[PDB]
Design an enzyme around this catalytic site. Structure first.
Site, PDB file in Angstrom:
ATOM      1  CG  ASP A 120      13.272  16.074 -46.573  1.00 31.45           C
ATOM      2  OD1 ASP A 120      12.222  15.464 -46.901  1.00 31.45           O
ATOM      3  OD2 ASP A 120      13.993  16.655 -47.409  1.00 31.45           O
TER       4      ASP A 120
ATOM      5  CB  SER B 200      17.234  16.157 -47.382  1.00 33.88           C
ATOM      6  OG  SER B 200      16.489  17.371 -47.450  1.00 33.88           O
TER       7      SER B 200
ATOM      8  CG  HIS C 223      11.732  16.634 -50.746  1.00 32.50           C
ATOM      9  ND1 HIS C 223      12.839  16.321 -49.987  1.00 32.50           N
ATOM     10  CD2 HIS C 223      11.996  16.202 -52.002  1.00 32.50           C
ATOM     11  CE1 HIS C 223      13.726  15.703 -50.747  1.00 32.50           C
ATOM     12  NE2 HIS C 223      13.242  15.623 -51.974  1.00 32.50           N
TER      13      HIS C 223
ATOM     14  CB  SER D 282      14.799  13.152 -53.377  1.00 33.11           C
ATOM     15  OG  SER D 282      15.173  14.465 -53.256  1.00 33.11           O
TER      16      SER D 282
ATOM     17  N   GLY E 286      16.369  12.970 -58.512  1.00 32.20           N
ATOM     18  CA  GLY E 286      15.963  11.589 -58.613  1.00 32.20           C
ATOM     19  C   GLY E 286      16.535  10.784 -57.437  1.00 32.20           C
TER      20      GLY E 286
END
EC number: 3.4.21.81
Lengths: 51, 185
Positions: free
Chosen positions: B63, B156, B33, B141, B139
């Site tokens: 992801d 994720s 993402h 991720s 932040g």
């Protein structure tokens, strides 16, 4: 930013900040919209970016 | 730069997952993402230090994403902060894990479930996720989930926060390594 499709059970964790009416910087739209919902619609958007 | 450090695209900030390589070609993994719709990545908010360009992206459904390094001088440590990473492994229920992210830093917990489905809405559904009781925040991720010197996953999303506690889902890193034919070092 519209929070109609909220709440959502989970959010991705990318950082694209929003500034809420409570002076708190929300990390992204999903985070912000879930808070709005939790606030029973009392929290609103002050501006885009950090507070 | 190493696992857990901040990375910036034109749209926002995420965290570097793991530094990986194929032959003599270096890349880094992060969340799909985050790579979705991103071309260039920088090491700083000023966007003055380039890292590389997006080479692959898989989200939703999975992801993970991979970025090819174009910066020739920046150190590409095969660690997570100070921690050495020497291999990758599959998550198991009850496994003690640790995550590092650019916003919250390092937090630990355990794997509570496997093959979880997470619906981020609007048709963004991801499958086969590792569920944990580790917290994470915007932040974080793409940051690494590791266990000792073993690479386990990529951050994720989820719910809660680090103050009150939360549930974070991770993309199994083994799947990403296989997809791109790269390996940790």
């Amino acid at each position: 930013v519209d929070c109609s499709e909220y709440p959502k059970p989970a959010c991705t964790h990318e950082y694209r900040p929003l500034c809420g009416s409570d002076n708190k910087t929300y990390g992204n739209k999903c985070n912000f919209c879930n808070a709005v919902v939790e606030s029973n619609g009392t929290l609103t958007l002050s501006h885009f970016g950090k507070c | 730069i190493s696992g857990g450090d901040a990375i910036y695209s034109s749209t926002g900030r995420c965290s570097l997952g793991f530094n990986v390589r194929s032959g003599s070609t270096y890349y880094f993994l992060t969340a799909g993402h985050c790579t979705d719709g991103a071309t260039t990545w920088w090491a700083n908010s000023a966007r003055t230090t380039v890292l590389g360009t997006t080479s692959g992206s898989s989200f939703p459904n999975n992801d993970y994403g991979i970025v090819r390094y174009t910066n020739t001088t920046i150190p590409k440590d095969g660690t997570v902060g100070g921690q050495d990473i020497t291999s990758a492994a599959n998550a198991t229920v009850g496994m003690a894990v640790t995550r590092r992210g650019s916003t919250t830093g390092t937090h630990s917990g355990s794997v509570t479930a496997l093959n979880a489905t997470v619906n981020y809405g609007g048709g963004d559904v991801v499958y086969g996720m590792i569920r944990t009781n580790v917290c994470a925040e915007p932040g974080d991720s793409g940051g690494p989930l590791y266990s000792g010197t073993r690479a386990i996953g990529l951050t994720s999303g989820g719910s809660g926060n680090c103050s009150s506690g939360g549930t974070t889902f991770f993309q199994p890193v083994t799947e990403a390594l296989s997809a791109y034919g790269v390996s940790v070092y």
